[PDB]
Amino acid sequence: RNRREEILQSLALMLESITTAKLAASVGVSEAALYRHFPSKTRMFDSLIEFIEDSLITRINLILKDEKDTTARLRLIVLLLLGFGERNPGLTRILTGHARLQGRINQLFERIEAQLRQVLREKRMREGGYATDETLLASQILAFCEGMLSRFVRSEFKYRPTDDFDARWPLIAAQLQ
Amino acid sequence: RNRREEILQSLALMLESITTAKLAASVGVSEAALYRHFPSKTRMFDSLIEFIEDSLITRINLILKDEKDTTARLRLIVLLLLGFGERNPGLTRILTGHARLQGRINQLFERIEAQLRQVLREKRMREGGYATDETLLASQILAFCEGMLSRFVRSEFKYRPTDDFDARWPLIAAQLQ
Secondary structure, eight states: OTTHHHHHHHHHHHHHOOOHHHHHHHTTSOHHHHHTTOSSHHHHHHHHHHHHHHHHHHHHHHHHHHOOSHHHHHHHHHHHHHHHHHHOHHHHHHHTSOOOOHHHHHHHHHHHHHHHHHHHHTTTTTOOOOSSOHHHHHHHHHHHHHHHHHHHHTTTTOSOTTTTHHHHHHHHHTTOO | OTTHHHHHHHHHHHHHOOOHHHHHHHTTSOHHHHHTTOSSHHHHHHHHHHHHHHHHHHHHHHHHHHOOSHHHHHHHHHHHHHHHHHHOHHHHHHHTSOOOOHHHHHHHHHHHHHHHHHHHHTTTTTOOOOSSOHHHHHHHHHHHHHHHHHHHHTTTTOSOTTTTHHHHHHHHHTTOO
């Protein structure tokens, strides 16, 4: 439980810089034990993407209750995606292609997209909404985020996702009209 | 010359759906001959990316002289990138990661970025310019394009880059103030 996300953290770190025997050891436990959590290396890579996705949602559910204004929530969620990709180069090169189990990656994206989609919806919900389809908008914002994460990896990490974010945000805000 | 881009077209098609013996045959010529153009499979994959990049610039140099207005030039160049990725799924999965020689891919991107960067520059050149660094802007537009190309591949081609472009362009135009 608290130990599974422990095998997943150790996994993300190993990717960063597998071997189920070294990983099991990493977390004071044995292969037999580790395999009782993740019987296949395929299942834990899935759980790893899922772990990222859940962790990412947990960070977003925090924004949605600190900030009530839609533009502010957006600003932070986008900053979370950028910042996450920047802090986790290894994981971000997997979500960006440069590394199947891609249905699970794509699920993670459709997922972050639906959280964006509703933050944009909860705007008309109390303003009975945007002049643009929130589906078109959510996907327009995610495309940027996804494009910034895809540079970074490309430029051999010369371009950091959160560089000049204060100069960029305005460009995105101009799309929320 | 006209025959090299012929080996490169046949290459792009084969990727779409190698083997230097089948490729050579493809173009009524022999391996010996083909190898005198591209001695290494590494050199022609490079020439293939370059071929894409040059072809892409050729299409842009056309826009720059049909349309004189900056927003119109932009609209089309972005539509060319989207449309290109949509017409060439195979090549676009290589530029998107899902396929080293990545310094050459990245060069292609920095390249399309510098063409964007100057179309934005040639705006102040006769209006002595945008309220945003054209470098920040060019890279903001390319990020979107790159993000749309990265979906497409992801969604197993459910999301086409040029879908709803007429509803999206406005969102980008709002970033040119």
